[PDB]
């Protein structure tokens, strides 16, 4: 019970791992911060005392208050009002547990776990302190929630006639905190079997809140327990779990460590800094580097130009993977999702149950209304993967026509008409009709009928798979090497050792980059390009002199413009290069060729 406090206080002070102790440092470190927080390493904790760990592990919930009320003690020593209790977060990475198995045994047992959150509730208050007075006796009192597992745990005492419980709330004098109410779901990969994945509500309080984006892959710890609630039986209570602490895989969060910038600067210096990424995207993949290259330019985010008037350049473009199966484009986008920090893989229809249209749904209780969400909103300001785009129902397919440009969706459903913002960069993988012969046809006569669908698209790719013997046998064997003994997989080590991207770091690299530089083209690059498309505009119409039907827009050029900052963003340079531009031309020229066919 009492005085176990000082033992932590000892580890708060007595502990020094050579040459420098930590948590005692962390406290003053948080002091000027006014952080009011401590992140504990539990695996570290056992290193101090073996007893108190499991001595803590026995009923960790009850010894929770034994800390922050203790941490203030020397913190108050170091403070020398008012001083709210700090928020501790202890953490451990050691044994990770499946969501598939939660045993009632685990109640009041702290468990570290990976997780994938469905969503989180809007924040709501909890009063850590309150003052209360008899509605009768005029008797003055005060209460606190010092810690809690919602119960409700406490109520108004009835001892002031006067009664019952004449004491009443005073909010002004009372002091408060917050809770997120997370809802987390297990990793989809395993082990749902044929059954649907279980979902779980995780409790985030105070600093815990706002710390995680919805839908993100996350690692979390906390305590298994059950709340009776009411809104089951006989006398059965619904499952709930405390979150402490949550140390989530980074980011999975705009801020980052400083030395990261430098190691990237090492990458920014590389002459091959772009060209190495050309290989990184397709470790298993063979060829199609142009389309492979066309990937990255979209990866860095599109041009955002907000200067007056409110007209703004969009992002990021559009791309089409259309080609005969064996294109491995769907396999490609599966790599694409893994590469994007935030992205949505959609083969639909929609994916998986997600409305391809962000749509409206009513609140079950108290009627009302709310946005039910949409994939565009889910991934907003990021990557979009699409399959069966030709198989897409054309009606919400219509909404796609809007989503790509104006990048703001609005619906009048019920009373809520509000216009949402969508900054996502979509890419269309839809398979072409009738295999090869459509290339024998017009370039159009594929998507819907009209190419107006293509009009909204920017870089559209038609895969030509030709049966060349040497070309196949190359990747043909390349395939077997992909397999056991995973000979190709071992090749990446030397590529990891010498040069080649790890691609998770690269994601951090891009996320770094995407927020970092705002490249603005050099004046001569444009004139180089202005002189360019005017030819292309004039030349393709020379193809149009035969009344040949296929296409061209001034938006076609603007899309190319976003390619200017694209690789240039990889360069990190403040302004676009003259030389840099040219590859965009010949690369888009390869895109124009698809129109040429």
């Amino acid at each position: 019970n009492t005085e176990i406090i000082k033992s932590f206080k000892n580890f708060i002070l007595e502990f020094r791992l050579d040459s420098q102790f930590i948590y005692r440092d962390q406290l003053r470190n948080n002091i000027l911060v006014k952080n009011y927080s401590l992140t504990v390493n539990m695996e570290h904790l056992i290193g101090y005392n073996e007893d108190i760990y499991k001595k803590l592990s026995d009923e960790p919930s009850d010894i929770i208050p034994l800390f922050e009320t203790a941490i203030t003690q020397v913190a108050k020593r170091i403070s020398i009002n008012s001083l709210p209790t700090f928020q501790l977060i202890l953490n451990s990475n050691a044994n990770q547990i499946p969501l598939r198995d939660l045993d009632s045994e685990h109640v009041s047992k702290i468990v570290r776990l990976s997780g994938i959150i469905i969503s989180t509730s809007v924040l709501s208050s909890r009063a850590t302190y309150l003052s209360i007075m008899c509605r009768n006796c005029r008797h003055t009192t005060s209460i606190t929630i010092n810690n809690f597992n919602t119960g409700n745990t406490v109520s108004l005492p009835r001892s002031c006639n006067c009664g019952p419980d004449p004491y009443i709330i005073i909010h002004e004098s009372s002091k408060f905190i917050d809770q997120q109410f997370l809802k987390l779901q297990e990793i989809p990969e395993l082990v749902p079997v044929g059954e649907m994945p279980r979902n779980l509500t995780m409790t985030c309080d105070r600093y815990l809140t706002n710390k995680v984006i919805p839908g993100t892959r996350v690692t979390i710890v906390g305590i298994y327990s059950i709340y009776n609630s009411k809104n089951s039986g006989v006398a059965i209570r619904t499952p709930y779990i405390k979150i402490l602490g949550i140390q989530s895989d980074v980011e999975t969060v705009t801020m980052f460590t400083e030395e990261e910038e430098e190691e990237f600067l090492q990458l920014s210096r590389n002459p091959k800094l772009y060209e190495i990424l050309t290989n990184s995207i397709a470790p298993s993949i063979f060829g199609n580097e142009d389309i492979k290259k066309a990937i990255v330019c979209l990866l860095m985010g599109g041009s955002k130009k907000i200067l007056p008037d409110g007209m703004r350049l969009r992002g990021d473009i559009n791309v089409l993977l259309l080609g005969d199966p064996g294109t491995a484009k769907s396999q490609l986008l599966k790599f694409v999702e893994k590469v994007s920090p935030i992205a949505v893989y959609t083969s639909g229809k929609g994916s998986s149950a997600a409305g391809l249209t962000a749509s409206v749904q009513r609140d079950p209780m108290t009627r009302e209304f709310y946005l039910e969400g949409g994939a565009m909103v889910l991934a907003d300001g990021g990557v979009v993967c699409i399959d069966e785009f030709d198989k897409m129902r054309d009606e919400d397919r219509v909404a796609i026509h809007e989503a790509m440009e104006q990048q703001t969706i609005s619906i009048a459903k019920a009373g809520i008409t509000t216009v949402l913002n969508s900054r996502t960069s979509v890419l269309a993988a839809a398979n072409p009709i009738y295999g090869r012969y459509d290339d024998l046809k017009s370039p159009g006569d594929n998507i819907d009928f009209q190419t107006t669908i293509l009009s909204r698209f920017d870089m559209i790719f038609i895969v030509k798979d030709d049966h060349n013997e040497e070309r196949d046998i190359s990747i043909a064997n390349h395939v077997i090497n992909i397999h056991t003994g995973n000979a190709n997989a071992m090749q990446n080590q030397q590529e990891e050792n010498g040069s080649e991207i790890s691609i998770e770091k690269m994601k951090r690299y891009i996320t770094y980059c995407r927020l970092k530089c705002a490249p603005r083209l050099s004046p001569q690059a444009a004139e180089k390009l202005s002189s360019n498309f005017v030819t292309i505009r004039k030349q393709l119409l020379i193809n149009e002199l035969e009344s040949t039907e296929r296409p061209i827009t001034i938006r076609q050029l603007e899309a190319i413009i976003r390619i200017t900052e694209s690789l240039a963003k990889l360069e990190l340079s403040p302004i676009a290069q003259e030389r840099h531009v040219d590859e965009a031309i010949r690369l888009f020229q390869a895109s124009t060729m698809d129109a040429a066919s």
Binding site: I213, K230, G373, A412, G415
Partner: protein, 591 residues
């Protein structure tokens, strides 16, 4: 009461004695209050105060109001009303203070709030939604005891009472007060306040990357009530109220419903507006020029090439077209509606963003859309106290404003039939469950649609190219088809401005137009008629051998078009000179 309360009141003497500027302003209220007393045999008691003076007065009392306004405020409340007594005590009552600020900490938007920001007066701004409708609320009660007479008296305090927490005292309602005489309810001697409550969503403009906005509630009482319609952009300022139990109130999870109370909630344009003299004189100076309008046209497309004829129609739509309603007969439609159409990558929707900004009212639309758009869609059931309440859709919410439509061709025809009711009739009709009404939607409107099929919007006939038959065509006063046709001579012009893109004043325009709206309507002049009569008739005499549709409604627009340019000229009267402008854009309408 503690002197801490009496001293703070006493601490408010020299202020607002200095700055004393509010002292007579309340007296300015006193007089006008007395003014109305003079004519009838209206101003709210509450007064505005720039918080700033506390920084030159008490910095502790300053931040304290930011800290514990619940305490510092109530004494400040008294002295105002107290001095209000001394200001005029002769002739025979909240008297609230707003505080524009003088901010802030305490400057936050609703999306980011508390727990620390709780229990503190703070500016918070955003959309007004969904704005619960108003209901009346009593405080004081009074009675008569027969046959012994006299008069009874009773007081009330709710949860949202004043600012600070106080002992809850629901009284039922005063009756049979000793001696046991029957007590008849007495009113108007007793006190009342109509009550209002509204949430506010944080701006999507300032909204973060991938997440939804969260609207938060605020109470509206007395004058604070009905100061604004729902959907408005406004900055609310007041203390954040945490009142209500955490489930502890009844021994037995989530808890503490909370909102900000008071205070200013300054309406914000992001109309209003101040004009002054120097500014409007520019209007008065610019009005003389007949050369101004093309400048008015050129300013419209900062990033946009040409289509100035398309542009000219836009401002003429800003004018409103001079609604004239029949005496004891139906009004003809005043405002003009148009739709952009043409091959993809027209930048028509782009143009709507321009229509979307300086316009100031109103909401745009992209395809679908509905259910109902401006339909209330019968907000139901109840909400609240069993009370059915309709909440107007955008089309209604947009009344006396602009309507932009993206993907108008993709929109379901179900609500299109309503748009006939929306446009020709220019009013809303509602029967669902339900409430039965017909409410005015006169809102100005525009839309946009692609070619029915492909790039053939040129070759194929414009009919079957409409994509939305039929009377829909008659509705719009102008339909401009945008050819995607390209020219190297054109593209050469297309490049550099597109080039200068990546690397007369606009705001002055909306002020020029806004004042141009209420002043002054040109009415009508037969001289404009003289040419146009030969014009439109000749238009039916020729165009019918060229194109269509051709209707008197198109002629009716001529009055609208000329009506607008007469405003563009700021002419007190219509001129035939304007018709040549309208007819020409109408010439351009055909060609």
């Amino acid at each position: 009461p503690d002197a801490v309360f009496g001293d703070r009141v006493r601490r408010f003497q020299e202020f607002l004695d200095t700055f004393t500027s509010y002292r007579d302003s309340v007296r300015s209220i006193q007089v006008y209050n007395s003014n109305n007393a003079a004519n009838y045999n209206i101003l709210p008691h509450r007064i505005i105060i720039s918080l700033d003076d506390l920084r030159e007065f008490d910095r502790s009392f300053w931040s304290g109001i930011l800290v514990e306004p619940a305490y510092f405020i109530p004494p400040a409340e008294k002295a105002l009303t107290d001095l209000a007594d001394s200001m005029d005590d002769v002739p025979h009552h909240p008297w609230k203070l707003s505080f524009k600020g003088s901010f802030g900490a305490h400057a936050l938007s609703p999306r980011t709030l508390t727990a620390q920001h709780l229990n503190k007066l703070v500016s918070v701004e955003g959309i007004v939604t969904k704005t619960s409708l108003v209901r009346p609320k009593l405080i004081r009660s009074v009675h008569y005891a027969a046959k012994t007479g006299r008069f009874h008296y009773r007081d009330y305090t709710d949860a949202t009472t004043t600012l600070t927490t106080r002992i809850p005292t629901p009284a039922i309602y005063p009756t049979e007060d000793t001696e046991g005489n029957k007590l008849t309810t007495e009113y108007g001697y007793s006190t009342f306040i109509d009550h209002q409550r509204i949430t506010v969503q944080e701006m999507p403009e300032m909204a973060p990357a991938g997440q939804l906005p969260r609207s938060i509630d605020v109470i509206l009482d007395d004058d604070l009530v009905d100061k604004t319609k729902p959907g408005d952009r406004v900055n609310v300022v007041g203390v954040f109220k945490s009142l209500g139990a955490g489930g502890m109130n009844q021994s037995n999870l989530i808890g503490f419903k909370t909102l900000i109370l008071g205070n200013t909630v300054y309406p914000l344009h992001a109309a209003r507006q101040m004009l002054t003299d120097f500014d409007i004189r520019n209007i008065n100076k610019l009005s003389k020029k007949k050369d101004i309008f093309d400048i008015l046209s050129q300013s419209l497309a900062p990033s946009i090439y040409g289509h100035d004829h398309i542009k000219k129609a836009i401002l003429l739509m800003l004018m409103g077209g001079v609604e004239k309603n029949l005496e004891n007969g139906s009004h003809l439609r005043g405002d003009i509606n148009i739709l952009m159409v043409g091959d993809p990558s027209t930048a028509k929707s782009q143009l709507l963003r321009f229509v979307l900004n300086t316009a100031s009212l109103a909401i745009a639309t992209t395809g679908r859309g509905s259910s109902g758009v401006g339909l209330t869609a019968a907000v139901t059931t109840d909400r609240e106290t069993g009370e059915r309440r309709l909440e107007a859709g955008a089309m209604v919410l947009a009344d006396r404003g602009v309507v932009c439509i993206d993907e108008f061709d993709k929109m379901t025809d179900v609500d299109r039939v309503a748009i006939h009711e929306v446009m020709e009739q220019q009013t809303v009709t509602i029967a669902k469950a339900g409430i039965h009404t017909t409410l005015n939607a006169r809102c100005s409107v525009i839309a946009a649609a692609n070619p029915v099929f492909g790039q053939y919007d040129v070759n194929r006939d414009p009919h079957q190219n409409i994509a939305l038959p039929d009377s829909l065509l008659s509705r719009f006063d102008l339909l401009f088809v945008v050819t995607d046709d390209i020219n190297e001579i054109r593209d050469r012009s297309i490049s550099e401005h597109v080039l200068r893109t990546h690397r007369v004043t606009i705001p002055f325009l909306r002020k020029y137009v806004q004042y141009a709206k209420e002043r002054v309507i040109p009415q009508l002049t037969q001289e404009a008629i003289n040419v146009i009569v030969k014009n439109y008739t000749d238009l039916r005499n020729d165009d019918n051998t060229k194109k269509s549709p051709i209707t008197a409604r198109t002629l009716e627009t001529l009055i609208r078009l000329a009506t607008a340019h007469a405003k563009v000229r700021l002419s007190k009267t219509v001129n035939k000179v304007d018709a040549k402008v309208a007819a020409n854009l109408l010439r351009f309408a055909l060609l």
